[PDB]
Structures are given as structure tokens and as C-alpha cells.
Amino acid sequence: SHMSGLKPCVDWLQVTFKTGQDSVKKCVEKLEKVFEILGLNEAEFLPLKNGKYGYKQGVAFQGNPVLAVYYDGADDMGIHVEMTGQGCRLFELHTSINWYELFYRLVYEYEVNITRLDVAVDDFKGYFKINTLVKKLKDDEVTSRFKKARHIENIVIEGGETIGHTLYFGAPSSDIQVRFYEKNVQMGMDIDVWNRTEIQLRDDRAHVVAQIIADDVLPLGEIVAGLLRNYIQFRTRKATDKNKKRWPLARFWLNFLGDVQPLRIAKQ
Amino acid sequence: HMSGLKPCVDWLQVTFKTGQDSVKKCVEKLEKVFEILGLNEAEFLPLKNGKYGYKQGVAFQGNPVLAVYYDGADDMGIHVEMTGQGCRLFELHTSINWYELFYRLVYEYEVNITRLDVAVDDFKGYFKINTLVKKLKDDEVTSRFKKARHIENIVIEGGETIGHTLYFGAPSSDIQVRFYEKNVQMGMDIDVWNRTEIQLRDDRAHVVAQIIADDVLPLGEIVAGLLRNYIQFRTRKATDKNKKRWPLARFWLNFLGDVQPLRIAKQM
């Protein structure tokens, strides 16, 4: 492909429109309103076979469950929107608004719980190999606010080659998880370099980042880079000192974080 | 102090369909479901939330490991979910047994069995998971699967790798096999505890259910047969380069031979 550089994006979104709150912001109660808030044409939503998460019914954009709106749950469950990775791309292709506008509305105009937001960086240049990260972890060259990482690798049974590496930091249910993987391998695509770094945020953490996107002032890159820097330090072993806390941050990592900083969600 | 090999049923999910023109009886009431399970109606309490598109649920002694979901969209029926712990809980309190439950589900009532897991606990230690990993990477394995996933945990302070796990097949596909160190997974102070699990979905699950219900073959023979057929750990033979003519490894032949006669007892 002609894919190059680093590119940031929003990669998951789940929000719930609450009902019957005495709130300063507007409560949403109708599906039609939800479609409008998204900047998407009502006519394009179709019913789904099944609900999900305790909601008895759902609709989806062009019938596609990657971009779904669930409703008719137990008392006070409101309306729940779910936009997977693919759904965020689908949103982008058809919405009449901008990410910042969507988040403006969710943050400032309506009464919503933002339950999950994932932000990502695609790396088409190749600042590092995931396996280098794995190695650094196993060689005791990493510090972090997390206690453990999960390492997943695929093994092709005929031949025995290890082809794709994934690292997960934090529990999936907790309010911040970081993931690194080879997205070329994951997607079955024939591109030499495509690494993905993802931060998954839940509840309050997700709201704050939504607000920052809404206000549109700080580049998204700065939030991603600030969070990665703070949560995880890949370091270079220094023979002189045994205190890991005084090893310098590794060069590939400083370069990655420094080139991530200025990145902005594309506007149009 | 535990020893040997022990089989068990380790997950079950079924849906009672409504309004089928069927030779078998349609179930339409929760009370009937409790009776089919041989469990006391009085012991079921409401859950906070539904799940999977069902708006409401109850659970045995309030405990969601053994749950019954209902009030979903038209034609969704009633869904029972029994996790690992729920299968143990079922065993302790039911007035019937596994054979009778599967008899009822396969021959008496109109049900979709969506998932069934069967497991073997190994307290002797017929192999180490890491040996299996190594054999895979050394090109000493053939299988009907194309890939395995190897999952390991890495402790960030120190870099120690703990908790090796191997998965064969995708989690959505209709047969998956898993091997892991269950002593490590459960945080328990037992020297050797390996677990082998076969997860089956839809028709694959029904077939094994039907085998249990017919009560002609030991369960051990189905587990051992599936393992043998789907995965072959082999010993490298210097004379021949063709993997297909390497003999099966000894530990593996010993494991499968001792799994064969294992049974699900008639008393829980």
C-alpha cells in the first residue's frame, strides 16, 4: 500500500443515553434523536435479529452490528450505542459531522455515560517490533504502573514459525488497558509493517479523553503519548547501576513517543 | 493430595425454543426449566441484569454461575448458562444426574445446545505445557488445525514467564482445545494440576450431549478420540523428513490411553 507514518484514531466507542435524570444536560429518549446526534441518516438503520447486554432489541447502521444501537432493557438502562473498530470506520465514511463534534455533543450537550473509548496509533514505518518489547519485558528492562503483561503468539503448526505477537497490559475489565500488536498479521493483510498501539479506557477515564477530543485543543497524540509514557517505560540496561528506575528510557521508545505527540485526528 | 486423571462436564449453555411445531415438548415456563434441571424452584433468585439480549434473569441461590435468562425478543425462548463453577454447583444440589439431564435435553425437549465443554484434570503430570509449546515450534506436531495460540504471563518486575496456555482453534469456531496449568491459573498450592479442555458449540456440542445421553461410550473415549484425531504430538525421526510418518510421542500415547476409559459417574 501507500500507507506510511504514524496515524492516530478513535477505535471503539460505547455510550449509554440515560433516562429520567434531573440533569442540567438534555436527556435523550428516542432512537431518532440518537441517529441525529451521530449525524447519520435514520433511513439507513435496520433492525437486528437480537439484542445484546441485557437489551432486548437493537438496530444497526445498514444492518451492520459493528455500529449498533440497543434499547428496551431493564428499568433505567436507557439507550446504548456500540461502535467497534470497524464501526468507527463505517461512522467516518457516512457521518455528516466530525469526531470532535460528536464528542462535544456527548460531553457538553447530552446526558450520557461514556462507558468505553479506545484510542489507537497505527505505525506503518516500524518504530519497533512487538517481539523486541516482549524481550525487554523478559530481560527485566521494563517498569510500569502495571504488574504483569500477557503475551500471545501464533504458531503455524506446519513449519513451527511464530508469526504474530500481541502484548496486553492491564485487565480487560479495568479502566485502562494498553495493547500492542502486529495488525498486518491480525488482519491477514500483505503489508510488511503495520503495528498497532491501543489504549482502551472505561468510564471516567474514557470521559476525560472524550472531553479532550471535544475541546479540540490538545492533539490526540499528546494524550496517547502522555499515557503510554506514564504507564510504561521500556528502558536500556545500564551496567553501572542495578536500580532499574535510573536506567534511561530506550531510544526507539523515546522516538516513538516523540513522533506520536503532535498527531491529530484528521478533520475532514 | 489429589491424583490421576478426572473427567468432567465444565460448561453448558442451552436454549429452550418456543412455538416450534416439534415432536418433542416445547418448554415455556421458568418453573418447568427448574424442574428439568432437578433443582428447587424456591432456590432461584432474581439477577440485577439480563444478558445476551435477554432482559431478565434468575440464578440458583442468586449465583450467576448457574443462570437462567428470559424475556428476550420473540422466539428467543429461555437460556440456561452453567459455567465451570455452575456445573459443580449443579452437581451438589440437583436431584438428577448428568446422564438424565442430557437425556432430557436431547430426547424429551426441544432445545438448542449452544455450548458444551468437557475437561480432563491431570494431577499426575503426563506432560508439561511448555513441552507442548516446544514441540510445536520444533515442527514436531501435526493437526487438523492450522495454528495454535501460545499465551504466557510476564511479571514486569523480574521478567519471569508464568502460566503457559495453548489454544487450538478460534473461540467462535465449533471446536477448540485448550491446555493450561490450572494450579497456576487458580492460585492454588498444588504441585501438578494440568487441565485439558474441549469446547464444543452448536451441532458439535449436541453430538457429544447425545453420546452422554445414549450412555453407551465412556466420555473418556470421545475426549481421547477427539484429541488423537485433531492433534498429533510426534517424535522426530532422523531417517525420514516426512512428519506424517513420525510415530506419536510416548507421553502423548500414554496420556490418551489413560484418558480413554474415563467416565462420568452416575452419582454426582
Residue numbers in the entry:
A (entry chain D): -1 to 266
B (entry chain B): 0 to 267
Quoted from the paper:
In Gram-positive organisms, the smaller plasmids often replicate via a rolling circle mechanism, a process mediated by a multi-functional replication initiation protein (Rep) encoded on that plasmid. The Rep proteins possess two related catalytic activities, a type-I topoisomerase-like cleavage activity in which they form a nick in the (+) strand at the origin of replication to initiate DNA synthesis, and a religation activity to join the ends of the parental strand that is displaced during replication. Despite low overall sequence identity, there is a high degree of structural conservation between the catalytic domains of the Rep proteins from these Geobacillus stearothermophilus and Staphylococcus aureus plasmids. Structure-based sequence alignment reveals the conserved residues are almost exclusively located in the β-strands containing the Rep_trans motifs, and it is likely the crescent-shaped catalytic domain represents the canonical fold for the Rep_trans protein family.
In this report we describe the structure determination of the core domain of replication initiator protein of cryptic plasmid pSTK1 (25,26) from Geobacillus stearothermophilus (RepSTK1 residues 1–269 (27), hereafter referred to as RepSTK1). RepSTK1 formed crystals belonging to space-group P212121 with four molecules per asymmetric unit, arranged as two dimers. The structure was determined to a resolution of 2.3 Å by MIRAS phasing using mercury chloride and potassium chloroplatinate derivatives. Each subunit is crescent shaped, with a concave inner surface formed by a 10-stranded, antiparallel β-sheet the outer surface of which is decorated with eight α-helices. The subunits interact via interfaces at either end of the crescent to form a ring where the diameter of the central cavity is 20 Å. The model of RepSTK1, crystallized in the absence of divalent metal ions, contains a water molecule in the metal binding site. The interior cavity of the catalytic domains is also positively charged, when calculated with a divalent metal ion modelled into the active site. The DNA binding residues of RepSTK1 have not been identified, but two extended loops protrude from the surface of the protein (the top of the protein as shown in Figures 2A and 5C) replacing the separate DBD found in the staphylococcal proteins. The differing quaternary structures of the catalytic domains of the Rep proteins may represent functionally relevant conformations, since the active site lies on the inner surface of the β-sheet and the diameter of the central cavity of RepSTK1 would severely hinder access of the dsDNA substrate. Enabling RepSTK1 to undergo such a conformational change would require disruption of one of the interfaces stabilising the ring, with the smaller of the two interfaces needing significantly less energy to disrupt.
